[PDB]
Amino acid sequence: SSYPEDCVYEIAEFTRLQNTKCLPPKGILQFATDLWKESG
């Protein structure tokens, strides 16, 4: 909602994005998938 021009975000505005539906970058996505497959 707030997009400060200096990219210095308010804590509440930054933390509210933890529920994002965006996918992580492909290198992270593949590694994390493989890591949880090797646990169970």
Binding site: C7, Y9, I11, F14, T15, P25, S39
Partner: protein
Amino acid sequence: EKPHPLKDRWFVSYFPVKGVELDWVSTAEELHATINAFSPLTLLPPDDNLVFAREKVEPFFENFPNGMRVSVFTRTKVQATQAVPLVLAAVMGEHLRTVTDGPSHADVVRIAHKPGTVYPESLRVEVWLRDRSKVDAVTKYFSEMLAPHPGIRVAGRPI
């Protein structure tokens, strides 16, 4: 709906108990998605470090000759859920700049599951500061930001 850009791009690596280079993150949404992919952080393999490095600085103590290490220790899953977003907001979100009067020099963030006998879900989140002169302001900031939760512990040690 538009992404929230990070002031700097951060390179993500994974160091099992050298590292595995994963990918860049340049928005708050990609950074949170990265944390969600490695969650619950409390179930990660013990001692492995998930690392975020500002502009891909090599995350080794040799590159921080007169730096400081600020550590946040949590004991439970509820405490990790509170502390981790707060550290990311202070560092990647750049909120620490409200006390550092310009760049914080908080250039590396490391997260590890460090199980204890009494508290198996214990996490250790480290923030590496390149510049030692700001460690007093940074520590006070983390202590105040985490004072509502007396279970969370904050400590500073040199590099």
